[PDB]
Each structure stands twice: as structure tokens, then as C-alpha cells.
Design a protein around this ligand. Structure first.
Ligand SMILES: OC[C@H]1O[C@H](O[C@H]2[C@H](O)[C@@H](O)[C@@H](O[C@H]3[C@H](O)[C@@H](O)[C@@H](O)O[C@@H]3CO)O[C@@H]2CO)[C@H](O)[C@@H](O)[C@@H]1O
Ligand SMILES: OC[C@H]1O[C@H](O[C@H]2[C@H](O)[C@@H](O)[C@@H](O[C@H]3[C@H](O)[C@@H](O)[C@@H](O)O[C@@H]3CO)O[C@@H]2CO)[C@H](O)[C@@H](O)[C@@H]1O
Ligand code: GLC
Ligand code: GLC
Ligand code: GLC
Lengths: 382, 210, 193
């Protein structure tokens, strides 16, 4: 079937739903069937024959092979799915860690930094590369990106099963008030959080995956399991895309920025030569359990150097930037700024004025950051 | 009787190359649709020679195009070219390569493995090789010692995953075939060959085309 | 040094009393370190009209600060400030730091002509995002920031792009925050929202 879909229908890859079920053995190997009398059905295998056949197939071996490494029987194999150094995986640990860090949770700075580097603690030991990790924050199942910052708990009463459906541990935060009717501060915080999730997705090592509608803030009303709804709750709203075109612009610009940077879509895990970790002061990251700030600088063959910082704390901070003699940091991305200044491009006639208005901070190697916000700066000669 | 190759360029565009055999030479029609990225016209630098055959508006100006012709009785070969806009800038495939197309041999199919006869009469060859990154087909006629014909396979057109493949209009005048993998000139016997020749010890055998 | 001169002028112009400054201090007259130039007829003791043109940014700041003092009702008090009108703030509103390690002094004052005036001096060597007093129905509007490059060190309606400059810090101002450099000072006015 897979070979037919690749050769006849010209499909480029496959994502396998509950792929861990494809690791469970069959009853043919029960010692009753083989040897006639006394391993059993449903036991996970180290080298499942089906995954061996897919990985080393002449055709299927060279297509994308993404795996949802778990099932409803209690088997969870993220980082351990029999891969042959070929299979990718839906990194659910990335999802959990990023959801927990970006929402202001203690003890996730180190895990978040590992996520930003392609999860080397999961994929490097086994012989796989950072891009074998499919990083994602939201998918079809679970909260949308907008619901992830609007609701604390699921609202699945419309599914009919007494709100018994979907993940109960969403790791979500309503950013203050719950529901779509909140104050202005909560709404601005939600915009910041959506942009922060997208920035984290688009600066991490790995493959960024996002669900349709997350580019403009699609909402399912808090329903995190809409498998049985043929109405607009699951439709792409092209009329609502225009209303929230600012978020769509930011996401498009972030994707383009990832494409341009040479040091974001890396073929190998970042090394200390290229990537340096900072805190509120350069070279002094805070890895403690109380830390809620993660910053780094990456050498770039096209951008020279890029400095990225995430401030998931509830407090603003004037973060000092690395000292590069003969150089200056030029602002590019700040999720706290009002649109279109959340992302600065040459299509803004007053970009130079906007940079000049913060030049007095950037000249002393400083940047003022709001709470729950991220920044990206580029090292320009000066 | 034609074969299309749709190369994705590195400046967000498409280049369609249609190769049609003549009833003897070959006709290669290059067509650039779209606009913007080619604003100002472009020239088909075939191997960067002093030629270049500037593309002229072929369809309503939306589809720019050029046409090349190649002499008959020529063995299978490869037309490699670049496109240069009207400012000196070059245009390459999305793999940063020069658009290369086969002439005399079709793309082929990855299945069945081995040698197959199609309804038209074209002979399909398919061989699996993951280790190799360069495969060529040798065709030997009745005695031969050295290949009567050699056809290198383009790793981008004549390959689906790890299955090198190539189709031929016909094999008239040829009695056996072999595969060269990696770059070592030693002929190899097709694992899936159903008919084979006589062993000859270095060791040598050829799959029969009958 | 420019920031510190502006800080001295702001301190002088936002205090109860009568401000006074020697001639040339409005453009940064320098005597070459001579503390006691009492026996010189040189240019060292002369107003330099060719230099107050070059240093027109500081002179403009001084003139604008003098006019701002003139306009404010709360700065030309005929009697000492009363705690009803004058409130003291720190890095967070309502929590002044009077400790021996403190190097930050901020206050807010009701002004019957302008609304409310918030003044802050950050004399420490570290920046600070200071929270502004919570005033429902109103928002603070940048007026003076000695760290800003000229002419934005003192915003005025004569600037064609004052609205743009305020909008570019609106995201900080909406949260009742202001980022200050080290050794700086700011003045804001409470305007209706
Ligand atoms: O976390 C305590 C810390 O921050 C507080 O601000 C916010 C937290 O930073 C933020 O994480 C959020 O807490 C929510 C959790 O993220 C999430 O699990 C959720 O579903 O419930 C929590 C809130 O109900 O919200 C808090 C503020 O409500 C707080 O301001 C600090 O004083 C404190 O140190
Ligand atoms: O700089 C290259 C380096 O980057 C990454 O290493 C960082 C980790 O991602 C990050 O978690 C953190 O690790 C520290 C722990 O958080 C902390 O608990 C403590 O015990 O020390 C750890 C390291 O000293 O910081 C490191 C870099 O310091 C990436 O994972 C590496 O593969 C890469 O080499
Ligand atoms: O079984 C534990 C795991 O099961 C699931 O696959 C969930 O996606 C994940 O969040 C959870 O931790
Ligand atoms: O994350 C996806 C969720 O739904 C799935 O079908 C899995 O069975 C469950 O473990 C998981 O929590
Ligand atoms: O109870 C049915 C449940 O089955 C699955 O494991 C899904 O993860 C969950 O979303 C669904 O509601």
C-alpha cells in the first residue's frame, strides 16, 4: 500500500498514526504455534519486522517516515521508536516542555534549551539528527494555538460523551481570565504568547510542524477533541484570517527568517563553537529550577550572528547583550511590540526611525523586554 | 512519443523540458511559465557555450520558451543547461545544479525489479542499490567484449528512492545487458534476471535481453 | 555625561525652591577643569555664543525644562509639599526604597493644571523597568527621558513624529511600565485614555 501511494500517487512521505502498535508482535510467534508447545501477542519488539521492512525497503526507505510513537494501550516510545537511523517522530516531549516553559512554569529552562537544540538527549545517542525530531506545539488533536492561550481546561460537552474526551493534561494557560471575553491586557498577553510559541517553533533545531489555522489564531471554543464535527469549528476561516492578518504576517515573516538563517535548519546538533548560552547577562545562563529565562547567540554564515531570548517570567527585564567590539545589535523581532513592529522589515518606511528610537538602549548593549516575550536581534557591523 | 521533465528552480519557478523523438533526431522544448523571477527575459545557456538560444514569448508572453534539435543516430546523451536572465544572473535547479535531461532514454519505472517489456515495446530496467550513488547500464550486442552501448543514469531522474531505473525505446541489435555501480567499470549481473549468459572467470556474466 | 547634565537640570527644575545656574551651564560651558577661574580674562571665563549653537540640543532641553517648570502648578509651590498631593514611588509604585543602598528616587504629584506628573531618577549603574502608578481611566504619556537621543529627550508638539515616538513605547506604557537606562531620569504626564 505504501509503495502504491509513493509510485502511483507521487506522495513524498507518511505520518503513521499510533505507530507504536506497529511494534507489537503477533501471535504467530507464541510458542504454541511455533514448536507446537511451550513472546506473546501484543508484546513490543526491539526490531519489529514491519518497521524493518519499511525502513529498508528500496522505495520507502528514502521517503519521510514520521511516527506517532505511542498508542492507547499504554505504550510510549518517544526517542525509542525502532528507527534504523531513518524514522522521524512526533516529538511530544518537545510539545510538553515548550508548553510548560512558555506558560511560566518552574524547572523547564534546561529542558527548553534542550528542545531548542533538537532534543540531543533523545536522538543524538541513537544516531539520529536534529531534523528527525518533528517539533510541534499544537496538532489536530488537542488545543489549537489560540485555545492554548485562552482555556485552562477542555470543553468537550459537544462531543456528547459527558466531556470525557481528549487530553486532560493540556499544560495550557488562559493568560489570566478564561474565555474569549477578557480585558485588553489579557488579549495583548495572548497575542504575545501566540507569537512566542511560533518563535520558539521557528528557532528550534528540527522540523517545525503546525496545524492549519494556527497562523491566524483559529479557535475551536475550548474543544480539544473535534473529531465528530462537520461545521465551521473545524473549517479554515478565510474571513477570520483577514481580521487577524497581523499574526499571519508575523508567522510568514518568522518562516522566511528561519529559511534565511543558515544556523536554524542545521543538519547536525548545535555545538558550543556556534551556540552560546546567556542569561540576563551574557555568558551566565540560569539553569536553576526558578529560572524562566533562556537566551542564546548563534553564529550565522548569512546573518553574521543572531541573538534569541525568551523571557517566560512575569517580570520585565533589561537584558544585556553580548559584547562584540566593532559591532551593534539591530532589532529584528520583538513579540511585545505592536504590529507591524513585532517584526521589522524593509517594507516599513519608518524602520530606521523605529530602530533609532531604541538606539539608546542598543548602544549600551541592552534590550528592555516585557514579561512573557521573546526577542531576536542580528549583529550588524558598526 | 514524448517525455516531460518538470524541474523546480531555485528562484521559485518551474522549467518544463519536453523531449520528443523524431520519426530520427530529437526535439527538446524548454518552457518557463510564470513571471516576476524572470522579469526581463532569459537565455538558455546550453553548457554555457557561446550559443544560448534566447527564449522568445511562446504562449501569450506568460509561457516563455525555446526549442533545440539534436542529430539522429546519436547514442543516448544528456542535455545540461542553465538559464540566465537579462542581467547576467544565473538560474539553477532547487538542488543548485544545471538543468540536465536525458535524450534517447526515458525515465523508466521502479517496478518490477529487473528487466520488463512494456505494452509499447519499450524495455524497462530497474535495479536496487543503496550503497551506489552512480549507476550505468551496459548493453552488449552479438559477438561483445566491451559494451556496445553505455547509458549513465541521472541520480535525480533515473532514481526512485534507492531503485535506479531507465526505459529504452527498443533494444534491437542488443543481446545482453549489465549494470555498473559506484563507478567501477566491472559489469554486474542483474539479481532479478530470469535469463543469464555463460559464466566467464575476474568473473563476468550478463543477463540476456531475450 | 550628556545624560548626567540633563539629570542635573531635571533635578534643578523639579524641586521646590528657586533654581539657579551659572551662565553657560545651559549649553555645557567648560573651563578645562579649572575649579576657581577668578583671575582670567581669557575665553575660559567667556560665554561662547559659537559653542551654544553647536550644543543646541542641551540648550533646547534646558529651555523646555524651564518652560515645563513654568507651566506646572505643582512645581512652583508657595508652601512645602503636602503628602496628599506628593506620593513617593520606587521600582514599583507605592514602595519607595529609603535604604542606604537605594539609588532610585521617584514621585508622583497632582497638578491642578496638567493632571498628574510622574518624575523618576535612576542614579544607579543598572537599568530598570519601573512600574508606574495604577490610574484607571488614564495612561502615562512620555514627556522627558534624558537617555533618549535629541530631540526626543524632551517630546513637544513641534516634533512632526511625536505620536510615532509615543506609539513605539506604547507596549511598555500600556502595562504601566517604563524602561530606564542607568544614571537617567524621566518625566511623564497622566492623560485621559
Ligand atoms: O507561577 C507562579 C508565579 O507566576 C505567577 O504568574 C502566573 C504564572 O507565571 C503562570 O504560569 C500562570 O499559572 C498558571 C499555570 O501556568 C497553568 O498551569 C494554569 O492552568 O494555572 C496557573 C494559573 O491559574 O498564571 C500565574 C498568575 O495567575 C505569579 O504572578 C507570580 O507571583 C508567581 O511567582
Ligand atoms: O552549547 C552547546 C550545547 O547546548 C546544549 O547544552 C545546554 C543544555 O541544552 C542546557 O539544558 C544546559 O544544560 C545544563 C543543565 O540545564 C543544568 O541543569 C546543569 O546541570 O548543567 C547543564 C550543562 O552544564 O546548558 C547546556 C550548555 O551549558 C545542548 O544540549 C548540547 O548538546 C550542546 O553541546
Ligand atoms: O502515556 C504518557 C503520554 O501519553 C501520550 O502519548 C501523551 O501524548 C503524553 O502527553 C503523555 O505523557
Ligand atoms: O496525544 C494524543 C493522545 O491521543 C492518542 O490517541 C493516544 O492514545 C493518547 O495516549 C494521547 O494522549
Ligand atoms: O475515550 C476516547 C479517547 O481515546 C483516545 O485515547 C484519545 O486520545 C482521546 O482523545 C479520546 O477521547
Amino acid at each position: 500500500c505504501l509503495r502504491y501511494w509513493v509510485t502511483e500517487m507521487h506522495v513524498d512521505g507518511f505520518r503513521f498514526d499510533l505507530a507504536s502498535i506497529m511494534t507489537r508482535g503477533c501471535s504467530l510467534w507464541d510458542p504454541v504455534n511455533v514448536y507446537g508447545s511451550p513472546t506473546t501477542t501484543g508484546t513490543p519488539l526491539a526490531t519489529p519486522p514491519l518497521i524493518d521492512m519499511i525502513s529498508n525497503d528500496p522505495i520507502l526507505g528514502d521517503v519521510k517516515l514520521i511516527a506517532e510513537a505511542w498508542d492507547a494501550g499504554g505504550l510510549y516510545q518517544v526517542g525509542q521508536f525502532p528507527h534504523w537511523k531513518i524514522w522521524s517522530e512526533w516529538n511530544g516531549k518537545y510539545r510538553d516542555i515548550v508548553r510548560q516553559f512558555i506558560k511560566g512554569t518552574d524547572g523547564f529552562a534546561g529542558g527548553f534549551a534542550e528542545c531548542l537544540c533538537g532534543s540531543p538527549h533523545l536522538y543524538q545517542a541513537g544516531g539520529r539528527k536534529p531534523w528527525h525530531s518533528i517539533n510541534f506545539v499544537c496538532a489536530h488533536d488537542g488545543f489549537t494555538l489560540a485555545d492554548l492561550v485562552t482555556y485552562n481546561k477542555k470543553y468537550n460537552s459537544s462531543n456528547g460523551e459527558d466531556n470525557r474526551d481528549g487530553e486532560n493534561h493540556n499544560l495550557s494557560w488562559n493568560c489570566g481570565e478564561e474565555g474569549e471575553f477578557a480585558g485588553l491586557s489579557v488579549k495583548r498577553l495572548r497575542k504575545r504568547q501566540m507569537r512566542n510559541f511560533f518563535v520558539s517553533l521557528m528557532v528550534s533545531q528540527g522540523v517545525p510542524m503546525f496545524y492549519m489555522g494556527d497562523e491566524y489564531g483559529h479557535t475551536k471554543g475550548g474543544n480539544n477533541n473535534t473529531y465528530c464535527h462537520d461545521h465551521y469549528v473545524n473549517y479554515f476561516r478565510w474571513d477570520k484570517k483577514e481580521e487577524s492578518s497581523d499574526l499571519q504576517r508575523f508567522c510568514s515573516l518568522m518562516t522566511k527568517f528561519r529559511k534565511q538563517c543558515e544556523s536554524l535548519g542545521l543538519a547536525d546538533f548545535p555545538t558550543a563553537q556556534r551556540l552560546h548560552w546567556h542569561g540576563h547577562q551574557p555568558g551566565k545562563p540560569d539553569w536553576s529550577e526558578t529560572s524562566r529565562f533562556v537566551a542564546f547567540s548563534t553564529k550565522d554564515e548569512t546573518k553574521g550572528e543572531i541573538y534569541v531570548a525568551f523571557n517566560a517570567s512575569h517580570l520585565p527585564a533589561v537584558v544585556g547583550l553580548p559584547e562584540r567590539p566593532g559591532y551593534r545589535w539591530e532589532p529584528l523581532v520583538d513579540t511585545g511590540k505592536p504590529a507591524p513592529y513585532d517584526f521589522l522589515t524593509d517594507d516599513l518606511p519608518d524602520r530606521a526611525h523605529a530602530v533609532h528610537l531604541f538606539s539608546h538602549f542598543l548602544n549600551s548593549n541592552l534590550y528592555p523586554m516585557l514579561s512573557y516575550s521573546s526577542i531576536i536581534l542580528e549583529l550588524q557591523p558598526d | 512519443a514524448r517525455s516531460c521533465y518538470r524541474f523546480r528552480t531555485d528562484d521559485d519557478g518551474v522549467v518544463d523540458v519536453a523531449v520528443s523523438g523524431e520519426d530520427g533526431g530529437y526535439a527538446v522544448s524548454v518552457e518557463v511559465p510564470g513571471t516576476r523571477g524572470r522579469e526581463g527575459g532569459l537565455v538558455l545557456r546550453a553548457s554555457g557555450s557561446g550559443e544560448g538560444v534566447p527564449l522568445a514569448p511562446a504562449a501569450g508572453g506568460a509561457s516563455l520558451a525555446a526549442e533545440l534539435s539534436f542529430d539522429p543516430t546519436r547514442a543516448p546523451f544528456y542535455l545540461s543547461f542553465l538559464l540566465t536572465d537579462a542581467s547576467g544572473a544565473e538560474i539553477r535547479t532547487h538542488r543548485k545544479t544545471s538543468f540536465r535531461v536525458p535524450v534517447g532514454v526515458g525515465p523508466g519505472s521502479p517496478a518490477p525489479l529487473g528487466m520488463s517489456i512494456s505494452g509499447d515495446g519499450a524495455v524497462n530496467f530497474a535495479v536496487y542499490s543503496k550503497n551506489a550513488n552512480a549507476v550505468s547500464l551496459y548493453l552488449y550486442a552479438a559477438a561483445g567484449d566491451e559494451p556496445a552501448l553505455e547509458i549513465d543514469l541521472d541520480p535525480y531522474i533515473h532514481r526512485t528512492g534507492n531503485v535506479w531505473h531507465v526505459s529504452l525505446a527498443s533494444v534491437d541489435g542488443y543481446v545482453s545487458y549489465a549494470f555498473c555501480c559506484g563507478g567501477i567499470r566491472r559489469p554486474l549481473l542483474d539479481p532479478y534476471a530470469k535469463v543469464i549468459g555463460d559464466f566467464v572467470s575476474s568473473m563476468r556474466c550478463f543477463a540476456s535481453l531475450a
